[PDB]
């Protein structure tokens, strides 16, 4: 730090209201690591909350951030090592003008309703595409057991 | 706890470890998981080269920390 863009971004995440994302504490030596909580609204994750880490590369905003889920989760696009294939921050769509609050917003959007035409976990993908409801009940005992509170 | 020792060959080796463990112990866990003899290993953390005989906590290695594994040149 340096990291004068990361400050403005932290400021305009804390004050942006952030209903679905909270308890955002940060490594304040260089704001290159954030931790926060995702609080899904629609089922099958509305009975849970999820610790994530956001890792900013040293050359941010030239390279995108990396999001990992610290809390386990049952999602066709999040592997069991917590990696989320979130398109807006992929190495192919990353723009410099993209702010972290838009990142989160699209992460939420991904939690609320997945997209299984491209999945990190194929099972799941098909268990969503076919059988939308056998998915949810399993997602629910996963979030019930493994996810966090409040929400 | 659990740490990631990262190489420049893009292998991430996960190690099972306690804050009590010495740098020598962690080198030993590397020799066992990779075959690399400790006398030719270099561990670095957050820009500090980890001296043998100290411990993970002296260096404040919390969990999920990434070490870096580099080899010593054969000659020296």
């Amino acid at each position: 730090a340096a990291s004068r863009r990361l400050m403005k971004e932290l400021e305009e995440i804390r004050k942006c209201g952030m209903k679905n994302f909270r308890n955002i504490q940060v490594d304040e030596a260089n704001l290159l690591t954030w931790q926060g909580l995702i609080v899904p609204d629609n089922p099958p994750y509305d009975k849970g909350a999820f610790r994530i880490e956001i890792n900013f590369p040293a050359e941010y905003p030239f390279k995108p951030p990396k999001i990992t889920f610290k809390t386990k989760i049952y999602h066709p696009n999040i592997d069991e090592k917590g990696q989320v294939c979130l398109p807006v921050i992929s190495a192919e769509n990353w723009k410099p003008a993209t702010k972290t609050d838009q990142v989160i917003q699209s992460l939420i959007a991904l939690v609320n309703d997945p997209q299984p035409e491209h999945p990190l976990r194929a099972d799941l993908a098909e268990e969503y595409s076919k059988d939308r409801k056998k998915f949810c009940k399993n997602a629910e005992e996963f979030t019930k057991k493994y996810g966090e509170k409040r929400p | 706890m659990q740490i990631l020792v990262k190489t420049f060959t893009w292998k991430t080796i996960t190690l099972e470890v306690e804050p009590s463990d010495t740098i020598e112990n962690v080198k030993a866990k590397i020799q066992d998981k990779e075959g690399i003899p400790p006398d030719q290993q270099r561990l670095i953390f957050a820009g500090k080269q980890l001296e043998d005989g100290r411990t993970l906590s002296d260096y404040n290695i919390k969990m999920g920390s990434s070490l870096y594994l580099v080899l010593r040149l054969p000659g020296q």
Binding site: A2, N30, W94, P96 | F8, R42, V70
Partner: protein, 373 residues
């Protein structure tokens, strides 16, 4: 006066400049790097132009048999191994060497880069190939050619896209908080570089944007390896004058250090994909007729045009990697035909405008791929 000729020229320069007698390189496989580095460093550049006698002790008199163009393969594999922290891979998924800024953690790193410089020049000088080579920007530096923003695409694609995004968009109402400085992590430790005086306090805006883009581009190529690079070029130049290289481009120099690779024309066709073309559009039919017809050197050059390298992964075309992950050789149909074909090495993609005659496709493709300055 193309590659064939450049090659004869370079070979003649070497022949015509070789000292007599021989030079003894005594190593053993078990201690190949330390023995090599010891042997080569004790000799004068001139001596490295005498005849080469390599001994592998313990294999000593039967064989050879042999021999050590094996030393060149084996050693190249040792000294260029990123584990040792002298050179590093260019990206996660593409595997051609560049200098690692972390190299300083080696007690005398400038010596080892001088060694390696000598070593490679020895390879060119004695017409021996080495196992894996360097990135194309690396080669351009050796030829003293200027590195440009498009040279970035191959070695750091995200940094490239970001750079270009900033060139091609108005940013005034964009709240980018960009300053003339830039940070880099090495071995876990983060450091700050100003790009001009007090650059960390100068704000990037529409009016300085171009200057900024400029300096970033240098910095990204140059960052943390000025001294190792000079050590290398010096070590190389003592053995084989860099000026002997002046007729070569960076792609030809790749091919001179690697051999001519084996391309299985079947393996290629099986694993090519087509965007807005098909296996039956006769631009493609024409394409594959050109791939079968010509030289093996044209094929490598073509392989360089579309993929940024003449080498193939372990396995063949079925496992071609790009920037973001795997990506097969791909031909896509682009607009007009008053263009030349273009490529995207990070996507491994040939943009082939629909040409009007097999001869037209043949002459334009061949002009695009041979004319890379």
């Amino acid at each position: 006066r193309g590659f064939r000729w450049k090659l004869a020229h370079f070979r003649y320069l070497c022949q015509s400049n070789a000292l007599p007698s021989h030079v003894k390189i005594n190593v053993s496989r078990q201690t190949l790097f330390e023995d090599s580095f010891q042997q080569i460093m004790a000799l004068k550049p001139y001596d490295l132009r005498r005849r080469l006698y390599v001994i592998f002790r313990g294999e000593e008199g039967l064989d050879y048999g042999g021999l050590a163009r094996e030393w060149f393969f084996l050693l190249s594999h040792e000294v260029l191994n990123p584990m040792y922290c002298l050179f590093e891979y260019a990206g996660k998924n593409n595997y051609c060497l560049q200098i690692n800024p972390a190299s300083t953690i080696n007690p005398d790193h400038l010596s080892y880069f001088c060694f390696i410089g000598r070593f490679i020049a020895m390879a060119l000088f004695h017409g021996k190939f080495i196992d894996t080579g360097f990135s194309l920007p690396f080669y351009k530096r050796m030829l003293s050619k200027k590195l440009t923003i498009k040279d970035l695409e191959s070695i750091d694609t995200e940094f490239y896209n970001s750079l270009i995004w900033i060139r091609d968009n108005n940013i005034e109402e964009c709240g980018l908080e960009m300053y003339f400085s830039v940070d880099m992590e090495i071995l876990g430790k983060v450091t700050s570089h100003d790009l001009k005086l007090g650059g960390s306090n100068i704000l990037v805006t529409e009016e300085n944007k171009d200057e900024y883009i400029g300096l970033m581009t240098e910095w990204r190529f140059s960052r943390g390896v000025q001294e190792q690079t000079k050590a290398f070029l010096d070590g190389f130049n003592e053995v084989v004058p860099l000026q002997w290289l002046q007729y070569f481009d960076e792609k030809e120099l790749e091919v001179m250090l690697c051999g001519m690779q084996e391309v299985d024309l079947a393996d290629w066709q099986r694993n090519t994909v087509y965007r807005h073309y098909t296996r039956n559009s006769k631009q493609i039919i024409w394409f594959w007729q050109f791939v079968k017809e010509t030289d093996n050197e044209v094929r490598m050059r073509l392989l360089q045009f579309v993929t940024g390298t003449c080498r193939l992964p372990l396995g063949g075309f079925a496992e071609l990697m790009g920037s973001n992950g795997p990506q097969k050789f791909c031909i896509e149909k682009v607009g007009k035909d008053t263009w030349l074909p273009r490529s995207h090495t990070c996507f491994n993609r040939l943009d082939l405008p629909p040409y009007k005659s097999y001869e037209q496709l043949k002459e334009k493709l061949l002009f695009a791929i041979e004319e890379t300055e």
